[model samples]
Target: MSKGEELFTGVVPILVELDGDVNGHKFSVRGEGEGDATNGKLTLKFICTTGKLPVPWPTLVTTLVQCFSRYPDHMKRHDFFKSAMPEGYVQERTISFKDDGTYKTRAEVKFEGDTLVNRIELKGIDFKEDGNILGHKLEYNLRVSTPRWERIARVLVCLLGILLSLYAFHVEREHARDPSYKALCDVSSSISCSKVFGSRWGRGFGLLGSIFGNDSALNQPNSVYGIVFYAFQLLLGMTVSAMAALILMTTSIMSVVGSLYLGYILYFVLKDLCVICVTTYALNFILFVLNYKRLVYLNEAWKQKLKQDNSHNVYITADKQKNGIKANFKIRHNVEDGSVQLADHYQQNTPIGDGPVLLPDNHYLSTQSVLSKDPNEKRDHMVLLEFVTAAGITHGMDELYKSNSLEVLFQ
Candidate 1:
C-alpha cells in the first residue's frame, strides 16, 4: 500500500522513468515528482526482479535519486558544486524508503530558485563494488550566480601594477630629458625613483645590454617588462582554464625572481629606495601568490572531475612459473589532466636450482630525492627504482613514496 496524497499536489508535476542494471540486478525506477524546479517531493517506486539486491539498498537508491536531480550547466561550468553555488542551492535532501517486495523511495529536495533548471537526467549508476560507475546516456542543466571576488581582485592588482610601472617610466623619461628634473617620487637623495629607474640595472637588469649589446631591442626598460607582465597576468587570470592558470603561475614566478634581483640592486648597488619600484615588486609578489592559488584550485577541480567521470585504478598481478615469477603492474588513469608520481624499491635474488640462495646482509639506499618543481609539467608513469643490495646503489627512496604510490589507492 503506497501511503501518500496525490503526487503533484500544488506543484508542477514531472514524469521520470528509468530502467537500468545496478550491481548486476535489473532495476526500474518510476518517479512522480511534485515541485516548482526548486522545492520538490519525488515519489519513486523501484522494482527489481532479481533475487540478490544491491547492497545497502536505501543509500544507493538515495544517491541515484539525487543524481536524477541534476544541475548540468552549473556543474560543468564551475567543475565543482559546493563552493561555486550559493548556500542551500542543493540542500535539505531527505529520502525515505520502504521495502515491500518493491522499494518505494520518497525524496524531498530543496534548491535555491535563483538558478535555472534546464532538465533532469539519470547520467549514471554506481555499483559500489569498485570505484567504477556505469555510464547511462542521460544529460541536463542549471545556471547560478558564482562569486567573482578572486577575479576582480586579480584585475585590480594588475591594473595598479601597470599604473605604477607607467608612473615609474614617466619619471625616468622626465629625468633623462631634463637632468635637473625632480619627480614627486624622488623624495630625497636616498629615497629616489628617477635615480633607480635611470640606472643601467633598469634596462633588462643590465644583462640584456651585456648579452645583446647596449642598443639592442632586447635591452628594454624594466617598466616595459612590468607593463607587459601585468597586462599578461590580467588577461590570463580572467580565464577559467587550467592551462591559462599554469601560464600565469609560470610568468608570475619569473616576475618574483626578477623583483628579488632588482631589489638587491636597489639596496646594495644603487643604495636608493625606489618607492614606485618597491610597490611594483610587492604587486608582483601578490600576483604570484594569487596565481599559485588559482593553479592549485584548478588542479583540485580537475581531480574532482576525474573522480566523477572515470575510475582511477591500479592492478598488480604476479604469476609464478617453474623458475621465476612474472610480475605485471597496470595503472588506469582515464583522464590526462592530472599526473601520478611512482617510486618503488625491490630486491630479488637470482633463481638457483636446488642451491642455497645468497641474501645480501646490508642494503644502503639514499634518503634524498627531488621531483619536478614546475607546476605545468606532467609526471606520468615515470618510475624511480632504488636497489639497495651490494653494488653501488645510487638512487634513494623516501617514506613519502607510500603516499604517492598506487598501493595507497587500493589500500
Candidate 2:
C-alpha cells in the first residue's frame, strides 16, 4: 500500500493467495491504517498476492469484516452474526488472542470443533512492509453465534408476555367482566352486527361475546396484534362521534338553540364510557399508554360557609370621603392604585354611611346597566351579604363526605 493512501484506494487486503511462492504455504494479507465514522470508515483490500491461501482475497476481506464486528453489543444487533459468515455457514468456531498490542505474537484461530479443523495463527514475524497484521485479522471468530435456542428463547419470551396480558385482562375485569368499553362497543357492535351478522338480542350480549368480540382481538392475534386493534377501535369511535358532532354543529346555528352542544356532549359522554371499558382489558395488553384521571365536583355540599378577606373582597383602604383619590365614584376601580371608588359605587348597600359592597355573580337587581342602582338598601345589603357569606366558605358537608364508608371502600 502507498503511504497515506485512502483505505479504499491505497490500502489493499493482506493478500493470502498461495499462488506465488513454492510449497504454497506462504500467503500475504494486507493491512490498512485505522479510521472510524465518528472519524471515518477505513477500507482495506488486497492489491495482489503470490501465494495460494485457504481463503481468496475478496472472501478474506468479507470474512474478517464479519468477525471483527460490533464487540459487546451484538445481541442488540443480530445482523453482525450473519454478516460474518455471509456465505459458507459455520457449525462452530474457537479463537484466542492476547489483547495486548504485541504485533510480534500470533493469534490462535480454528474452525468447528478444536479437534479437526483448519487453523490460522499470526506469526511473531512481521513483514515490515505490511504492518498492522492482526488489525487486518479482524475476523475474530469468538464474536458471534446463531444457535437454535436464540429463536426458541425469543418465542417463549413473547409467549410469556402474552400470558401476562391475558392474566391482567382476567384479573382486572374480575368484577365487571363485560367492561364499559366492551359494553358500549357491544351496543354499537350490536347495531352493526345485527345490521349484518345476526340479531339485536345476540349483539347486545356486550362486546366480549362475539367472534371478534374481545377487542384485543386475541382470537385473531398475529404480527399486527396490538397496533391494528387499537387503530380500528379509534376509527370506530371517531366514526360514531363524527355523526353526533355533525348534528350538533348544524343545529347550534339557531338563535335560541341554548344547548345544541348537547349532541356533541353526548358523543363525548358515550366516548368516555367506551374508553373506560376498553381501557380495562386494554390496560393489560398495552406496553405504554398515557392516561389522566379526572375528578368533577358539584356545589350541592352543605358544608359551604363564607369567610372574610376573600380575594374579591375589596376593603375600605380610605374611608374619608372626598379625601381619597377614588372617593367620588360608587364602584370605580382606581386605575393607578386598583383601590375601590368607595363613595360613588357604594350604591349597593350604603346604609347612610356604609360603603359599596361586592355582590354575587348574578345579583337580584333587574337593571341591565351595572352603573345604574336602585334605592332599596335592604335588597342591596342582602346581595352584598350573600357575596360575603359565600366568598371564602367551603361548601357542603366536607367532613361527612370525606368519611363516607361506601365511597371510602370504592376509593
Candidate 3:
C-alpha cells in the first residue's frame, strides 16, 4: 500500500465509548454475538456502562477482532440476546474513594436489533486498588490499532490469521505439486521419454510447472529434451494428487475458524502444528494466515448461528402427531469453577406458543424423544448447522459466494 493508502481488517467495532471520565484503567473486552438475517446484515446496538476508557468507534469497523481480543468476559448462554453480563460485563462507574467504603457504579448498555454493537455510556465512577474491577471512566476515546493487537488476544488473532492463510494453501495444494520433486533424480538419464520427464530441458519443466501450476508450459521442447520435462510434470500431477488426498484428510478437522477460538487456539496450536505431528503447516500458513479476515468472518458466522433461544422447547411428536414438552434449557453453570454448561430437560406436552417449530427429537440428543418429529418451526432464525462445524464454520461468505452455484442462490 502507498504511505497514505487506507488499510483495513474488516472486523466490526463491538464496543463503543460514550460520555464519561475514565478512571485511568485499561482491560480487554470480548464476547460472542449473532448476526442479522441476511449475510453480513449486521446491525448491532446496545448500551452498557463500564468505567473505562470508552472504546471509540473505529475509523472503520474492520479491526474490531484485533482490538476486542483485550476484552475478557463471558456472557451467560441463557442471558444471550438478553444482556446478563459477567461482573465486568457492564462495568459501571463505581466510586471507590480513599475514605469511603461504598462501591458506586454508573454505566448502562443499550441494545439495537439484537446483536452486541450496543452503546455503552458511563458517568461518575472510581475504583479501589484491590478489587478485581477493570472499570474506568472514558478520558480518551480508543480505536483499534496494530499496537492494540499486540495484546494476548490480538497476538492470538494474528496467529489465527496466519493459520487461515495455511487454509488457502490447502485449497491450492494440488497446484503446488510440480514435476521437479519426482524427477529431480532422473534429470541426467538418457531414457527416450526423458525429454518430457527426465531430460535437462525437462528440468526446465519444473520451472515451468512452478510458474504455471500446470504442465502445458513444459511442452516447449528446449532440446527435444524439454518434452521430457513436460511429460514428467504430468506424472508429477498424478502422483501428487494421489498422495495429497491422503494428506488432506488429516487436516479436514484442523479448523481454528472462530476469531475467539482461532485467537485462543492459534498460539496454543502453533507448537503442536510445528511438531511434525501435522501435515498442514504450509497450507495453514498459506491460506489461513494470509487471510486475516477469516477470524472475523468465522466469528460473524458463529454468532449468527449460535444465537438461538433454546430455552423454549417447542417439541412435536412423530407419526403419532403428538407435541412434546417445552424444551427448557438449564444454562450450564459452575459456580466453583466459574464456568458454564448446558442441561436440557423435556416436559411432555408443555404447550408453547402454537405448533412445534422443531420437534424435540431434531435436537442433538434424542434418547428420550421420538424419531422423525415433525419439521421444526423457523422464526426468522439463521441456519447454524454448518457454522457450528469446525471446518464448516470457517467457510466465509466469499467462499460461499464463489463456490455457490446458481441453484443455491435461487433457493
Best by TM-score: 1
**TM value for model 2:** 0.21
lDDT of each model, Cα atoms only? 0.42, 0.24, 0.26
Residue-wise lDDT of candidate 2 within 167-269, one digit each (tens)? 4334333422335544555557421111111112112222233656554434432213323433333333222133433432332222112122322332553
TM-score for all models, in order of appearance: 0.41, 0.21, 0.18
Query: Which pairs of residues have clashing backbones in candidate 1?
Result: none
Stretches off by above 4 angstroms in model 3 are 1-17, 20-57, 60-79, 83-197, 206-411
Best by lDDT: 1
Q: Over 4 Å off in model 2, which ranges?
A: 1-28, 32-41, 47-164, 172-175, 178-411
Cα distance off (Å), candidate 2, residue 330: 84
Expressed as tens digits, the lDDT of each residue in 182-272 for candidate 1 is 5544544533334666668878877868788788887888888888889988876655566777788889889898889988988998786
Distance (Å) between predicted and true CA of 231, model 3? 25
User: In candidate 3, what are the lDDT values of residues 60-98, reduced to their tens digit?
Assistant: 021111111111121111111122211112322222323
> Rank by lDDT, descending?
1, 3, 2
